[PDB]
């Protein structure tokens, strides 16, 4: 039984802490972190129109 249990992997967020110099909330399950929406994902969205 490997130590990659889903209980430590699940995470969700609707609102929480926001970074200091910029907004775009803190990342990480340790904080209440939002999931990074990078440039590749944004290109995929642009391709979808």
């Amino acid at each position: 039984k490997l130590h990659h249990l889903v209980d430590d992997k699940i995470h969700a967020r609707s609102t929480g802490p926001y970074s200091m110099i910029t907004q775009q909330p803190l990342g990480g399950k340790a904080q209440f972190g939002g999931q990074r929406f990078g440039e590749m994902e944004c290109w995929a969205m642009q391709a979808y129109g």
Binding site: T15, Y18, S19, M20, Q23, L26, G28
Partner: protein, 272 residues
């Protein structure tokens, strides 16, 4: 000294003075310029002394060139306050001035949060004393030892070491990809839930206030400054309505008693 005296004397005679003869005036200006020339020559000569002295303050606090320039300022001050009639070598006197200038600059322009000098000296003292008691006791001296060796209350040792906590950098890669900056939560941002909570609180408070009689609403409003953010006492509301202070006080008491009734409390609890 001769150049300085010539400059001062001509400054004196620049106002209600005498038209000095061309030859004498020309010679005297040569003397003043020679005085400044001698000052520059001396400073250029002892720049090496300044560098050699500042060598021993390197590696801690600030950069090396800043130390050299502060030492140069100190040496200029020493040359300003140097006496030869006392018959002593220039280096002996200028060393103390350069040391003082460098140490003062270290005290001032070395820490992002400036601790004034006297505090700086007492903390540097604390550090040295704990270093020596570390040399002797071996284990880091506990606050008691420092307080004893420093003739201040131990709580003062605490605060002297609290003021001297150097900041850190929020641009440190915490790994050894992530800077410490983007791990720190802005604790003064609109949390977006208390904001809507406050909006609905104001809405429901306004409604429940509209329930009670109009005069009652007015008195409580202008008592806590809800209408425009300015709270006032009984006297002001009495003045504006042209009634003695006591009536406003009485109606306020009645208003509080009414609003405290369980009827108009379950519509306002869960907001406190």
């Amino acid at each position: 000294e001769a150049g300085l005296y010539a400059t001062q004397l001509m400054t004196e005679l620049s106002e209600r003075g005498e038209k000095l003869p061309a030859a004498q005036r020309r010679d005297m200006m040569w003397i003043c310029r020679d005085g400044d020339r001698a000052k520059n020559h001396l400073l250029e000569a002892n720049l090496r002394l300044v560098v050699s002295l500042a060598k021993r303050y390197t590696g801690r606090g600030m950069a090396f060139l800043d130390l050299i320039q502060e030492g140069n300022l100190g040496l200029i001050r020493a040359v300003e306050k140097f006496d030869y009639t006392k018959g002593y070598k220039f280096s002996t006197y200028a060393t103390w001035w350069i040391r003082q200038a460098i140490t003062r600059a270290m005290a001032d322009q070395a820490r992002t949060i400036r601790i004034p000098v006297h505090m700086v000296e007492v903390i540097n003292k604390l550090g040295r004393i704990q270093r020596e008691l570390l040399q002797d006791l071996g284990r880091e001296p506990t606050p008691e030892e420092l307080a004893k060796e420093m003739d201040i209350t131990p709580e003062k040792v605490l605060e002297i070491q609290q003021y001297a906590r150097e900041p850190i950098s929020l641009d440190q890669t915490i790994g050894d990809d992530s800077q410490l900056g983007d791990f720190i939560e802005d604790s003064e941002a609109v949390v977006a839930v208390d904001a809507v909570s406050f909006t609905l609180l104001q809405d429901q408070l306004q409604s429940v206030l509209d329930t009670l009689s109009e005069r009652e609403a007015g008195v409580v409003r202008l008592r806590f400054g809800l209408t425009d953010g300015q709270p006032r006492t009984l006297d002001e509301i009495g003045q504006v309505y042209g009634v003695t202070r006591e009536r406003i006080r009485q109606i306020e008491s009645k208003t509080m008693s009414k609003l405290r009734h369980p009827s108009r409390s379950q519509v306002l609890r869960d907001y406190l």
